[PDB]
Design a protein around this ligand. Structure first.
Ligand SMILES: Nc1ncnc2c1ncn2[C@@H]1O[C@H](COP(=O)(O)O)[C@@H](O)[C@H]1O
Ligand SMILES: [Zn+2]
Ligand SMILES: [Zn+2]
Length: 338
């Protein structure tokens, strides 16, 4: 309820204004955090579940849901500049919008929809603000536990599911044993897919599927087998995760400031511990503009272009914004003549 959020009517009214964009790409999650005592993930997730009647469908009481979500959100580190609950909220809301794209209407079951949004919400939980390689190079206990493979991603999953065991936190209590098994499988698949080292193989396989792309009498995509549906969900969450550059510049710029702050903080930690600094972690040798252009050209654009193709023409506006932002940064690159 509104009381669990500690929000008064004045801020509840502001929040109502902001939530008018719940199903839109233009929602401003920064404003949402500001009116919800900085609990953007729980607030947006509650709004999303209400909007999709997921609480009613899976018999999750508001009590259990809010208790779990508030617990999960508290396990995101508010001192980590980018990988915090604000980023998770953004990704969950972005996934929520992508799931409603015309080209995918009626394609996914409710359990698959539940799985993708949940995956998005927990995908970076308890992130330390440093990369897998940093954990590996410092002989971190986490790296040793997971044998240097998708260290953080494996940890995000373990924490997300482990927290269901705390008091009044099992939001999957009323799902059948079969549903829980299937949801777990799907969630694990999608979160492990957020590991950037799997990006290329994801894109490749994604393009391939687009070659075999099948539609209907209306333009709606056809995916009758699990394997094909999970590949789309997997890529959908990956796209939402990498959606910053496709948002209105006012938002994209705030995300970029955060990702750069987090990179510099890791650079500070490397210096503090006598380790050699990482690329783009050196606040004195990193070029924000150039980095963003490179990130879009080599990773984000190639990804969204393929997604745009799969859901043609649903994502066209997203691709255009992406391109405008890319050119804005391109022209923003500093210049020193003679
Ligand atoms: N705007 C951006 N510029 C450069 N790198 C980014 C940007 N947005 C996300 N990333 C990177 O994408 C990786 C995957 O995102 P995440 O799942 O949140 O960890 C992050 O670890 C960042 O290093
Ligand atoms: Zn991640
Ligand atoms: Zn993320």
């Amino acid at each position: 309820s509104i009381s669990r959020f500690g929000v008064n009517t004045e801020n509840e009214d502001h929040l109502a204004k902001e939530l008018e964009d719940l199903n839109k790409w233009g929602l401003n999650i920064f404003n949402v955090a500001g009116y919800s005592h900085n609990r953007p993930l729980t607030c947006i997730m509650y709004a999303i579940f209400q909007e999709r009647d997921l609480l009613k469908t899976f018999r999750i009481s508001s009590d259990t849901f809010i208790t779990y979500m508030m617990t999960l959100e508290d396990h995101y580190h508010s001192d980590v500049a980018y990988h915090n609950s604000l980023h998770a909220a953004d990704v969950a809301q972005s996934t929520h919008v992508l799931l409603s794209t015309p080209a995918l209407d009626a394609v996914f079951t409710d359990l698959e929809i539940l799985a993708a949004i949940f995956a998005a919400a927990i995908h970076d939980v308890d992130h330390p603000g440093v990369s897998n390689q940093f954990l590996i190079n410092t002989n971190s206990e986490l790296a040793l536990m997971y044998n240097d493979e998708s260290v953080l991603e494996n940890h995000h999953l373990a924490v997300g599911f482990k927290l269901l065991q705390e008091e009044h936190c099992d939001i999957f209590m009323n799902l059948t044993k079969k549903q829980r098994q299937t949801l777990r499988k799907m969630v694990i698949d999608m979160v492990l897919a957020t590991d950037m080292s799997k990006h290329m193989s994801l894109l490749a396989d994604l393009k391939t599927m687009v070659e075999t792309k099948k539609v209907t009498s209306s333009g709606v995509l056809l995916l009758d087998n699990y394997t094909d549906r999970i590949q789309v969900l997997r890529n959908m969450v990956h796209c939402a995760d990498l959606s910053n550059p496709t948002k209105s510049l006012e938002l994209y710029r705030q995300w970029t400031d955060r990702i750069m702050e987090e990179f510099f903080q890791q650079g500070d930690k490397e210096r503090e511990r006598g380790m050699e600094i990482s690329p783009m972690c050196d606040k004195h040798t990193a070029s924000v503009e150039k980095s963003q252009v490179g990130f879009i050209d080599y990773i984000v654009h190639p990804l969204w272009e393929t997604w745009a193709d799969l859901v043609q023409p649903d994502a066209q506006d997203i691709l255009d914004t992406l391109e405008d932002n890319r050119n804005w940064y391109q022209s923003m690159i500093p210049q020193a003549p003679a």
